[PDB]
Amino acid sequence: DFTPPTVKILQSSCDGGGHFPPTIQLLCLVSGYTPGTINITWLEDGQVMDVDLSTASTTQEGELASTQSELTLSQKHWLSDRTYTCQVTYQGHTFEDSTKKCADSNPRGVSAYLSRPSPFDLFIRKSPTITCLVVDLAPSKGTVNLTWSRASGKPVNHSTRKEEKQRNGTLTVTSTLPVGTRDWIEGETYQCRVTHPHLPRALMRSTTKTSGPRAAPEVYAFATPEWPGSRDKRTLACLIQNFMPEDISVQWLHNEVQLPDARHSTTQPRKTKGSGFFVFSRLEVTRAEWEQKDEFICRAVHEAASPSQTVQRAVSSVA
Amino acid sequence: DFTPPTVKILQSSCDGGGHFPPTIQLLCLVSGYTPGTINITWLEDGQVMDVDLSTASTTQEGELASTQSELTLSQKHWLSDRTYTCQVTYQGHTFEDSTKKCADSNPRGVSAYLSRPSPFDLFIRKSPTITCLVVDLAPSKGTVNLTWSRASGKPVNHSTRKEEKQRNGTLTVTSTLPVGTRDWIEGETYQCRVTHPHLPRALMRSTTKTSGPRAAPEVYAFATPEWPGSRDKRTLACLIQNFMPEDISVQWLHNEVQLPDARHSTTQPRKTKGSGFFVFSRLEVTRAEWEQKDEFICRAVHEAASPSQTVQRAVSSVA
Amino acid sequence: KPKVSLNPPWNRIFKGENVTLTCNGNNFFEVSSTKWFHNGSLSEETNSSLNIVNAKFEDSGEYKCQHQQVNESEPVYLEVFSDWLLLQASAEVVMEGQPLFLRCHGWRNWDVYKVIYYKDGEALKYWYENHNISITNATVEDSGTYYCTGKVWQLDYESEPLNITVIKA
Ligand SMILES: *[C@@H]1O[C@H](CO)[C@@H](O[C@@H]2O[C@H](CO)[C@@H](O[C@@H]3O[C@H](CO[C@H]4O[C@H](CO)[C@@H](O)[C@H](O)[C@@H]4O)[C@@H](O)[C@H](O[C@H]4O[C@H](CO)[C@@H](O)[C@H](O)[C@@H]4O)[C@@H]3O)[C@H](O)[C@H]2NC(C)=O)[C@H](O)[C@H]1NC(C)=O
Ligand SMILES: *[C@@H]1O[C@H](CO)[C@@H](O[C@@H]2O[C@H](CO)[C@@H](O[C@@H]3O[C@H](CO[C@H]4O[C@H](CO)[C@@H](O)[C@H](O)[C@@H]4O)[C@@H](O)[C@H](O[C@H]4O[C@H](CO)[C@@H](O)[C@H](O)[C@@H]4O)[C@@H]3O)[C@H](O)[C@H]2NC(C)=O)[C@H](O)[C@H]1NC(C)=O
Ligand SMILES: *[C@@H]1O[C@H](CO)[C@@H](O[C@@H]2O[C@H](CO)[C@@H](O[C@H]3O[C@H](CO)[C@@H](O)[C@H](O)[C@@H]3O)[C@H](O)[C@H]2NC(C)=O)[C@H](O)[C@H]1NC(C)=O
Ligand SMILES: *[C@@H]1O[C@H](CO)[C@@H](O)[C@H](O)[C@H]1NC(C)=O
Ligand SMILES: *[C@@H]1O[C@H](CO)[C@@H](O)[C@H](O)[C@H]1NC(C)=O
Ligand SMILES: *[C@@H]1O[C@H](CO)[C@@H](O)[C@H](O)[C@H]1NC(C)=O
């Protein structure tokens, strides 16, 4: 049994004319707690910022500790309405508090987005799904009606539904519907219909396989050279290009394990000047990985790839 | 001798939805001063507030003292747009700071944006410019008053003021101001100020150099191998990474001359997993070009690059 | 004959909104009782004013009234929509110099921002918040298919277009 810590965030005041100072200080204060190891992490719309951009200080008075953390932001970022979270880790328990730019009024309306299945899910996992994501609804009274249908009138499978309250005060609702693999490949169209008593009309989204022409991806993988400093970091890259249609899944494989998606970054598909789209993927690797096995495979899953909807290429950093 | 204490005002946070809490805390800080008698008084629109409405406390660290005072306001008082003054009297002399309810940068739905200089314009051409663009104004009569200024009061040049009505019935005004290279590099802040007769108050935007740490870019350049059936085309890829801050320009050169920007596609800066940002650049080339000269230079212009804010890497397609 | 008046004047409403059809003429015959004709069927209202409360989709269609005369009162038409933005208009056919009020209206008194009216494709007028257009002398060239783009709860909504045509008196 220990006394609860509490968390509050104060911020710089804008001046007597209503103008922001050129930098904004956020001061996260963790009031009196039982002495122990404590970590403070700042998040910007949920993503961890580098610890170099903030300070932290701990004092002890008597038998009680007090902690403060300071984060510095540009005026531009503060005015861009991003949400910032002070994350406190104390004895294996997490506390938190949130803030965004203040406002006199914060109107918002509901919006909706509908994804296609990923090629990886369609052709590797062999379990394709579609997701209808509805965000920025106002948490009024009542559940939001969300119905799936097919243009053919054939029956839909049972869907799963998640509702999750967000840091910015909205309620995001996600519905995931399994789709038939042959159904999707043969050009079926799926519709997500969103209703609510407070809406003026129904919101409708639909999705279907792209009717454009097909072209297989070309793949090229590379490693950067060795140079000072970056001795134990030898960033790898992969270029996937000249494919049609635009939907593609890129993964990295190493030593008979497909590494988690979060390890690497991947750009959004953009049009080439001539014919097709391209993406880049970037993967930072460590010394222990290439000393385990230095063969790293960039793999693309794409509807136009042959003979099995996959294309892959290996690279070795040493050669 | 006179000892100037510093004054700063901090305030309570509104929450993650931008709503105000039931009360507002203001915290006036007098940090790091030679010890002596000190009084702190709060004014609301210039009248002294009752002593029981705020509490002051003092600590000492080494030689330097620190003093704080906390004032509690109702939400209603904060929202009435009254001015609150922290008045510190130290050794008989008065030091002041003030605050009032902020102003949220969009009074009548207008938007204004203010860019930074491009690094290419700044370090290669040595003619940096900044651009202020104000959109979604009404096309009524009475010219918009556009004024430029520096926070230091030093002089600014004339700009290229230009207005034009859009196909969608709105009016956009754009101005481009040339600025001194050294003025920018040493951290001047530039302010664009717009006044329209129908707007209730003047609208201002401010821009300044980054406050984060500095890191020069790493530059890597690769040539794709020949793909079967594409004898007369190749793609060149350039990776630029681990730079700080995010502002960067990428150019391609062939035969010592810079190629048109339309020839290549470059992504927007995105964060790596650790320190810095990365971009990829893609340039398709033809047989006539590499037979003319098979050397192509990927050059990055970035504020952190030494000795002339420019670092480049050549590549050869054949080798 | 009598004519049919609308309060509010707008023959295009949203679902759930009210409207009251009043209908009157020269008092050659004293005002005693009235007959109502929704779609063609006789309605169960005697009173000179019919209160169409909480509109449903079936409340659309031709409306008409009648008295103890021998001839009927023209077929005013009432369309009912459910949508985000309805560009309401006073009258669908006008004679030069009469007032014409247009109003880009949002569901349940909601406030539509960044409102722009289009007449035949071109941007007729833009204002920051919602406004009326008001033309007191509708020219013969005023005839057009109108529609308005607006911003409700930060999101963009276009109204369904409505063609209107002036005539020479
Ligand atoms: C309050 O906080 C919530 C949550 O933090 C915010 O909700 C975000 O809302 C935005 C849009 O309003 C969401 O962005 C959308 O995400 C979709 C999800 O796609 C993901 O999954 C697919 C694979 O299925 C990936 O390929 C993709 O990269 C995503 O990882 C996207 O599909 C959407 O794309 C659509 O818009 C773009 C343009 O932006 C188009 O180019 C696309 O073609 C497509 O039409 C879109 O990107 C975001 O995901 C929401 N957050 C979360 C956590 O889900 C609220 O916005 C925030 N409120 C305020 C006021 O800021
Ligand atoms: C009526 O019609 C007019 C024009 O006909 C519309 O005005 C447009 O408004 C949009 C939104 O305000 C403008 O889009 C803005 O373009 C800026 C251009 O920046 C240049 O430089 C950067 C950096 O070099 C380039 O990346 C960029 O491509 C441009 O070359 C952007 O800088 C702006 O960025 C803003 O949005 C992004 C998200 O996309 C944010 O991250 C930023 O922080 C910033 O907020 C913005 O994208 C557009 O340029 C205007 N048109 C013209 C011709 O200028 C009106 O909006 C329209 N009215 C209505 C009601 O629809
Ligand atoms: C009198 O005649 C009217 C026009 O002939 C007629 O209006 C029509 O009414 C139906 C339903 O009452 C509307 O259909 C609406 O509802 C369906 C189902 O949700 C939607 O799919 C439609 O898009 C629409 O929203 C018609 O739209 C409507 N027609 C018009 C032009 O408005 C009345 O129903 C008739 N009334 C009687 C009593 O006969
Ligand atoms: C419709 O009319 C009735 C009768 O006057 C009124 O009580 C009701 O509030 C009206 N509807 C709305 C939405 O105001
Ligand atoms: C349009 O005019 C009517 C009356 O002529 C008025 O009631 C309404 O408020 C006006 N529209 C707006 C947006 O003010
Ligand atoms: C109104 O104008 C449009 C535009 O040409 C036309 O197509 C439409 O048929 C017109 N409406 C009627 C009822 O004539």
Side-chain angles (χ1 to χ4, degrees):
Chain A
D1 303 321
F2 37 85
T3 190
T6 58
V7 185
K8 279 282 180 185
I9 302 176
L10 313 182
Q11 69 291 355
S12 303
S13 290
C14 63
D15 65 20
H19 164 43
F20 290 87
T23 75
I24 306 292
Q25 283 323 299
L26 303 180
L27 191 60
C28 184
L29 294 176
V30 180
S31 70
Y33 59 99
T34 45
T37 180
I38 186 171
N39 195 30
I40 296 97
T41 303
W42 285 95
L43 309 180
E44 176 180 77
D45 200 64
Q47 189 63 249
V48 61
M49 302 73 80
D50 296 331
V51 175
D52 55 5
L53 210 68
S54 60
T55 63
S57 301
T58 60
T59 62
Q60 288 171 330
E61 41 269 23
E63 269 287 319
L64 205 64
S66 298
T67 306
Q68 63 185 359
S69 174
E70 193 186 49
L71 172 70
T72 84
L73 307 162
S74 65
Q75 170 183 333
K76 169 182 73 170
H77 289 171
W78 192 241
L79 297 173
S80 71
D81 212 338
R82 304 172 191 185
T83 297
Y84 298 91
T85 300
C86 181
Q87 198 170 359
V88 189
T89 302
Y90 171 81
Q91 316 269 311
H93 189 11
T94 67
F95 313 83
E96 325 278 319
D97 160 30
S98 285
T99 183
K100 66 173 205 179
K101 159 167 158 188
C102 217
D104 293 334
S105 73
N106 291 300
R108 206 82 207 157
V110 69
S111 324
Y113 309 91
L114 178 56
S115 305
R116 299 181 292 277
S118 185
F120 176 69
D121 289 345
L122 191 51
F123 303 121
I124 307 291
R125 203 185 127 189
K126 299 180 61 56
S127 70
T129 61
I130 58 181
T131 297
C132 188
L133 178 69
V134 63
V135 311
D136 281 1
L137 64 98
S140 75
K141 55 174 172 180
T143 305
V144 53
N145 230 56
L146 195 46
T147 54
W148 295 96
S149 58
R150 289 162 65 181
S152 69
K154 288 177 67 167
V156 293
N157 288 18
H158 56 245
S159 53
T160 60
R161 177 200 259 270
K162 326 302 155 293
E163 307 196 354
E164 183 275 309
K165 254 290 189 288
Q166 303 297 147
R167 281 181 191 158
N168 52 26
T170 67
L171 174 71
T172 51
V173 176
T174 307
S175 179
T176 301
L177 177 134
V179 300
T181 292
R182 308 280 298 289
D183 289 354
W184 178 266
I185 288 165
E186 181 263 355
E188 175 67 84
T189 75
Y190 298 87
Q191 183 187 326
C192 176
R193 185 174 196 104
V194 179
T195 315
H196 189 270
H198 205 76
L199 266 163
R201 209 217 191 84
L203 188 57
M204 268 70 63
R205 307 286 179 200
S206 294
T207 188
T208 190
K209 183 252 283 174
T210 48
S211 63
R214 267 153 78 85
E218 304 164 23
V219 54
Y220 312 93
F222 303 99
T224 58
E226 181 53 70
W227 68 292
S230 288
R231 183 61 197 170
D232 308 313
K233 161 184 256 206
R234 300 289 299 288
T235 306
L236 312 181
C238 188
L239 164 62
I240 304 303
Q241 68 173 19
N242 291 332
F243 56 93
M244 221 77 68
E246 68 173 14
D247 189 13
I248 198 159
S249 294
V250 56
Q251 51 203 9
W252 289 88
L253 215 172
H254 176 242
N255 193 69
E256 316 308 294
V257 82
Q258 174 195 124
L259 291 185
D261 82 300
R263 282 292 303 275
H264 56 93
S265 48
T266 301
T267 63
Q268 294 172 39
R270 297 166 164 285
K271 301 173 281 182
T272 69
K273 52 224 72 190
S275 320
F277 297 85
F278 74 104
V279 299
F280 282 96
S281 178
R282 180 180 179 276
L283 171 71
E284 309 188 26
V285 302
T286 63
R287 173 103 202 160
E289 296 179 327
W290 75 69
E291 288 188 333
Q292 182 199 346
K293 272 312 311 189
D294 53 11
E295 176 190 341
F296 302 84
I297 301 167
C298 169
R299 182 173 278 183
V301 188
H302 189 274
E303 299 162 2
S306 68
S308 306
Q309 292 81 50
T310 179
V311 62
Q312 65 187 92
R313 217 185 182 74
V315 60
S316 299
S317 279
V318 73
Chain B
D1 285 4
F2 73 102
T3 279
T6 65
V7 186
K8 201 178 170 293
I9 300 168
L10 195 71
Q11 65 195 34
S12 160
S13 288
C14 34
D15 69 85
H19 307 289
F20 289 90
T23 179
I24 307 305
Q25 286 318 274
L26 310 176
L27 180 65
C28 185
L29 302 176
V30 187
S31 75
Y33 65 102
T34 296
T37 185
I38 193 152
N39 186 30
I40 294 94
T41 298
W42 289 93
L43 317 180
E44 171 174 303
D45 284 344
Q47 296 92 43
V48 173
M49 309 336 306
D50 48 340
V51 178
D52 68 326
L53 208 66
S54 66
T55 41
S57 297
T58 56
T59 179
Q60 187 79 253
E61 55 277 15
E63 191 270 327
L64 300 168
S66 296
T67 300
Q68 66 180 1
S69 174
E70 186 43 74
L71 173 72
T72 83
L73 298 174
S74 68
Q75 197 188 328
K76 321 330 305 155
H77 300 142
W78 185 241
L79 288 186
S80 60
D81 219 336
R82 297 178 97 68
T83 300
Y84 300 120
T85 301
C86 177
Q87 255 177 339
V88 181
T89 303
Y90 168 85
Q91 288 293 321
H93 195 279
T94 60
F95 305 86
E96 289 177 71
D97 208 342
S98 294
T99 188
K100 59 164 214 165
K101 173 144 82 151
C102 207
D104 204 274
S105 72
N106 288 303
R108 300 299 301 286
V110 72
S111 285
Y113 312 94
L114 176 57
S115 311
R116 292 197 283 168
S118 170
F120 177 78
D121 289 12
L122 178 59
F123 301 114
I124 306 305
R125 289 202 315 201
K126 293 123 182 166
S127 178
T129 66
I130 290 191
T131 297
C132 185
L133 171 73
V134 55
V135 310
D136 220 332
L137 305 102
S140 67
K141 61 187 54 43
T143 170
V144 290
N145 193 343
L146 202 56
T147 38
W148 289 94
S149 71
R150 291 155 75 171
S152 67
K154 299 196 82 162
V156 297
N157 297 6
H158 210 271
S159 54
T160 71
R161 194 164 89 85
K162 53 175 277 297
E163 314 176 359
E164 59 255 35
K165 306 210 187 341
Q166 309 301 306
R167 159 59 197 112
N168 81 328
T170 61
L171 167 54
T172 75
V173 174
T174 316
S175 183
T176 295
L177 180 81
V179 304
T181 295
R182 301 140 307 292
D183 292 0
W184 177 266
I185 291 181
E186 63 97 354
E188 177 64 89
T189 190
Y190 297 83
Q191 150 170 326
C192 174
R193 157 67 70 89
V194 291
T195 316
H196 194 247
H198 299 69
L199 287 174
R201 58 197 292 289
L203 186 65
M204 150 295 286
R205 296 289 176 167
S206 306
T207 186
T208 198
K209 194 247 182 212
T210 50
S211 49
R214 309 316 294 288
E218 308 158 28
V219 57
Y220 309 104
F222 308 90
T224 59
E226 180 53 39
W227 195 267
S230 300
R231 269 285 299 257
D232 293 276
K233 279 185 187 177
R234 299 286 187 95
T235 305
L236 282 301
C238 187
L239 166 60
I240 304 300
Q241 63 172 25
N242 290 327
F243 53 96
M244 279 216 72
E246 76 195 53
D247 191 11
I248 195 164
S249 299
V250 182
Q251 47 243 47
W252 288 88
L253 299 92
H254 181 236
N255 265 107
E256 283 312 321
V257 75
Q258 179 172 321
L259 291 177
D261 300 331
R263 281 289 303 277
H264 59 87
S265 65
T266 308
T267 67
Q268 279 198 45
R270 56 160 300 159
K271 298 204 299 187
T272 64
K273 287 143 264 178
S275 65
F277 297 81
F278 73 100
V279 299
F280 284 96
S281 197
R282 181 174 178 276
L283 175 69
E284 311 178 34
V285 298
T286 69
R287 178 63 75 159
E289 286 171 334
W290 77 72
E291 291 188 333
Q292 192 182 115
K293 182 173 187 48
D294 55 14
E295 185 55 279
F296 304 76
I297 327 180
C298 176
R299 176 180 290 175
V301 180
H302 189 271
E303 309 199 345
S306 265
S308 299
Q309 292 76 37
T310 293
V311 62
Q312 67 185 19
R313 182 163 160 119
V315 65
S316 88
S317 295
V318 73
Chain C
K1 53 180 295 309
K3 201 245 176 182
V4 65
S5 79
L6 278 74
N7 285 3
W10 327 329
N11 58 15
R12 288 172 80 86
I13 42 174
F14 272 138
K15 193 189 182 293
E17 276 186 353
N18 310 66
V19 315
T20 81
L21 310 201
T22 297
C23 92
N24 278 319
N26 194 0
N27 295 294
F28 197 71
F29 188 76
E30 278 180 21
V31 177
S32 56
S33 74
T34 310
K35 312 288 193 69
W36 286 98
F37 293 131
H38 180 61
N39 273 103
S41 76
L42 179 96
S43 198
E44 63 267 31
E45 184 71 32
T46 83
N47 264 349
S48 71
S49 294
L50 178 47
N51 51 345
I52 289 281
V53 171
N54 201 29
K56 308 151 281 296
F57 283 102
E58 167 177 23
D59 218 314
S60 95
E62 159 268 352
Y63 280 82
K64 269 180 83 83
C65 80
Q66 159 62 17
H67 219 252
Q68 279 70 242
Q69 73 257 354
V70 311
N71 217 45
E72 271 60 28
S73 196
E74 283 85 3
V76 55
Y77 288 20
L78 261 59
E79 279 149 75
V80 282
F81 310 111
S82 172
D83 203 339
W84 274 274
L85 261 171
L86 174 48
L87 177 164
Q88 287 169 331
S90 181
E92 283 323 294
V93 293
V94 72
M95 71 66 67
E96 297 106 328
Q98 150 164 354
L100 277 74
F101 304 74
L102 298 98
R103 75 141 301 187
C104 185
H105 185 34
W107 189 249
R108 291 180 155 192
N109 306 24
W110 288 355
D111 306 359
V112 60
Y113 299 132
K114 298 193 170 179
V115 167
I116 312 104
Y117 290 74
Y118 291 102
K119 165 189 173 192
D120 287 321
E122 57 83 11
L124 177 57
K125 182 188 179 175
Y126 151 71
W127 195 251
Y128 308 102
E129 70 279 28
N130 60 344
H131 47 303
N132 317 74
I133 288 190
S134 177
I135 294 155
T136 66
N137 56 93
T139 183
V140 295
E141 200 260 317
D142 205 342
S143 302
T145 167
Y146 287 35
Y147 82 101
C148 75
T149 184
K151 206 82 80 170
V152 184
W153 301 115
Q154 60 63 38
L155 301 146
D156 65 328
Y157 299 100
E158 184 181 355
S159 54
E160 53 259 33
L162 87 166
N163 169 60
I164 300 134
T165 182
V166 185
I167 204 73
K168 294 180 179 179

